[PDB]
Design a protein around this ligand. Structure first.
Ligand SMILES: Nc1nc2c(ncn2[C@@H]2O[C@H](COP(=O)(O)OP(=O)(O)O)[C@@H](O)[C@H]2O)c(=O)[nH]1
Lengths: 208, 66, 80, 353
């Protein structure tokens, strides 16, 4: 749709092309690429070659936006980031010395650790054989499990709410609990794992 | 007396722009006379306009007035 | 209706009223009882202030107008 | 290697050689000197650092040099601080209020005139104010923080005029000013009448050399601008019909002497004013122009590379930059374009990275 075939993907990294004179293979590759110079697609309104961002954060912000409200999702992301920053600094300045020295204040590492901890390991499928749906554990790639964990966190922060709760500080507290290996998303992950383990005698029904 | 003067056009998603890139000013963007801060309150447009100047490692030495 | 003319008249205006009140307060604070509005009207500083405020009322605000206004104020109020 | 945390808390010593110095202020000083005008988006930078550090700006220090030779016999002279939305206009007045507060002056600090106009639910009429509708719920807040503003002259100003309060209490001669302010607070039925009697009392004592009245109002755009408050029949009122602001308009008419008043144009509440307007006339209207008084406008410009380097060097010493690929020399120019030499825009990006 509005883009022909044999077209490449818009690049994002810049330091790789700032001095591409290392060896010969990539040199010949980029020379042959720039010879015929095909019509490269334009950069969308969401990607930036800056070093003060992260592709995972951009993907999470794009997934958070419901409908057409990029400014709303951006404001919510900025509020969540400043909230976790303020909470980290408040728990840092209100401590002793060993705790302040053994912990960091970078929210990116905390968010990455929370994502790696809440990421599942096995998945069940309702295989319809003979008229019944039996769960069979099947392997899943890394990106699929990451997307599943992200959507689980999103739906937990969205659906699970009462009336007096908010949203930025709520998500901040949820991320802080998930980083400490004690969170509701981790509880759901453990429940799914024990449910798959309770039905481990159905692996012979798989065909791939 | 227009040193480092150049113009261009552009048409995408029903939008016409005529940027005037200079190589002798600071690092600001003027949109229809006034600066881009009053016309682009969202950081999205600011990042979209900073991406070309960032890809060439030239920020505080190029001034534009589109 | 004098509020819809081509140029803002300095005479019988609120600007003239408040600047005359300020001049009266200054003359009363400087221990000077001999006050004459006709003598103070011929001052170049109040004339520059009048020209600046009339230009700012007529033509839109830019930068030279407010600069001349600030200069006239700083030269008339005798404050560094 | 940026010289910042070297100058002590002394606004009277800030000269041309102290360019970009993050001077430290005692925590107790902020509670007394600044008990009103405090931006909500800056208090977070004080409780986390425990140091009231403010970069010395060129248009901010230039105003302090003008007050070194300001005669007290001359009437009040306004000092408006206008500029681009974000270049530092609300907090630029803090660099001047702290200077005059140390010289033993009468500080008449006002929080924000924007809140006194918009967002007003409870409305009550008055009889001893030439029949005007004022805000009684607002007088209960400005009078409480007024005692802790200047605890060195409120107990000295004596009442020299009998004021008939209600049908049960009044005001006697020889009374201190500190007791008259905290007199009508317990009675909310007439608590909005104290702001029209105490404010007009310092007009007489300011002419002497012992008292130096200084009105510290933040945002004069709402004092003369039109309001959006309606009565009981759906009809917007005029800004000249509120007793809370009627007596405040007369104060900015150089009716007294002793020093000079100050001002600071903000943008948090300018009704019927566009966002693309930064000029003082375009943000106050015609009513905010016929009674401006010969003042000295100060244009708040952007930032220079001499002060931008002092920003990044201040957060590196406080382990604020928690990013890996960030202290790179090439990455320093990236933060300059994301803010375009603006302190408030850079503070938003630095609030999380
Ligand atoms: N006033 C002041 N603001 C500063 C200073 N340094 C950084 N800032 C920031 O710059 C921003 C300026 O915002 P401002 O123009 O007052 O917002 P406005 O009143 O809505 O126009 C504030 O949010 C501050 O956090 C300083 O020394 N003084």
């Amino acid at each position: 749709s509005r883009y022909s075939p044999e077209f490449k993907d818009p690049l994002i990294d810049k330091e790789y092309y700032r001095k591409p004179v290392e060896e010969l293979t990539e040199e010949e590759k980029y020379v042959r690429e720039l010879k015929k110079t095909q019509l490269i697609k334009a950069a969308p309104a969401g990607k930036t070659s800056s070093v003060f961002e992260d592709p995972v954060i951009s993907k999470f912000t794009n997934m958070m936006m419901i409908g057409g409200n990029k400014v709303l999702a951006r404001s919510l992301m900025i509020q969540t980031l400043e909230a976790v920053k303020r909470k980290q600094f408040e728990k840092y300045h209100a401590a002793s010395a060993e705790e302040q020295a053994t912990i960091e204040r970078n929210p990116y590492t905390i968010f990455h650790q929370a994502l790696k901890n809440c990421e599942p390991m096995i998945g069940l499928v309702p295989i319809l054989k003979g008229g019944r749906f039996y769960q069979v554990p099947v392997p899943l790639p890394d990106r699929r499990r990451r997307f599943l964990a992200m959507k689980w966190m999103i739906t937990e922060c969205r659906d699970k709410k009462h009336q007096r709760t908010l949203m930025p500080e709520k998500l901040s507290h949820k991320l802080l609990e998930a980083f400490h290996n004690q969170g509701p998303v981790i509880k759901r992950k453990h429940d799914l794992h024990k449910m798959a383990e309770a039905n481990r005698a159905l692996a012979h029904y798989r065909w791939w | 007396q227009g040193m480092a003067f150049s113009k261009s056009e552009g048409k995408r998603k029903t939008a016409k722009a005529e940027a005037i890139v200079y190589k002798h000013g600071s690092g600001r963007i003027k949109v229809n006379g006034i600066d881009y801060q009053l016309y682009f309150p969202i950081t999205q447009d600011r990042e979209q306009l900073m991406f070309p100047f960032h890809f060439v490692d030239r920020l505080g030495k190029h001034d534009v007035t589109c | 209706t004098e509020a819809d003319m081509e140029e803002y008249i300095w005479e019988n205006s609120s600007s003239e009223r408040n600047i005359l009140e300020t001049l009266l307060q200054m003359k009363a604070a400087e221990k000077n009882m001999e006050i004459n509005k006709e003598e103070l009207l011929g001052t170049k500083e109040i004339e520059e202030y009048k020209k600046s405020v009339v230009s700012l009322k007529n033509e839109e605000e830019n930068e030279n107008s407010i600069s001349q206004y600030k200069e006239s104020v700083k030269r008339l109020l005798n404050v560094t | 290697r940026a010289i910042s945390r070297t100058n002590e808390n002394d606004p009277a010593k800030h000269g041309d050689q102290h360019e970009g110095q993050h001077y430290n202020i005692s925590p107790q000083d902020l509670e007394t000197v600044f008990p009103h005008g405090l931006p909500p988006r800056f208090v977070m930078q004080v409780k986390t650092f425990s140091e009231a550090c403010l970069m010395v700006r060129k248009p901010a220090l230039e105003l302090l040099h003008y007050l070194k030779n300001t005669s007290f016999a001359y009437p009040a002279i306004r000092y408006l601080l206008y500029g681009e939305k974000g270049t530092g206009k609300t907090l630029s007045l803090c660099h001047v209020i702290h200077f005059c507060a140390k010289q033993d002056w009468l500080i008449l600090h006002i929080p924000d005139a924007h809140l006194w106009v918009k967002n007003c639910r409870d409305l009550l009429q008055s009889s001893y104010n030439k029949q005007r509708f004022d805000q009684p719920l607002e007088a209960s807040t400005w009078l409480k923080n007024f005692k802790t503003t200047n605890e060195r002259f409120l107990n000295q100003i004596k009442v020299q005029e009998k004021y008939v309060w209600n049908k049960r209490e009044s005001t006697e001669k020889g009374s201190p000013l500190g007791e008259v302010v905290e007199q009508g607070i317990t009675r909310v039925r007439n608590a909005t009448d104290a702001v029209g009697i105490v404010l007009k009392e310092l007009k007489r004592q300011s002419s002497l050399g012992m008292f130096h009245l200084l009105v510290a109002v933040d945002g004069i755009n709402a004092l003369w601008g039109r309001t959006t408050l309606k009565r009981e029949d759906k009809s917007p009122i005029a800004p000249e019909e509120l007793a809370l602001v009627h007596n405040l308009r007369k104060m900015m008419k150089n009716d007294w002497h002793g020093g000079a008043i100050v001002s600071a144009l903000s943008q948090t509440g300018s009704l019927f004013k566009p966002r693309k307007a930064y000029l003082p006339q375009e943000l106050l209207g015609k009513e905010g122009f016929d009674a401006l008084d010969p003042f000295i406008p100060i244009l708040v410009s952007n930032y220079n590379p001499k002060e931008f380097e002092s920003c990044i060097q201040y957060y590196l010493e406080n382990n604020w930059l928690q990013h890996e690929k960030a202290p790179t020399e090439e990455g320093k120019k990236e933060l300059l374009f994301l803010s375009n030499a603006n302190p408030s825009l850079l503070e938003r990006h630095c609030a999380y990275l």
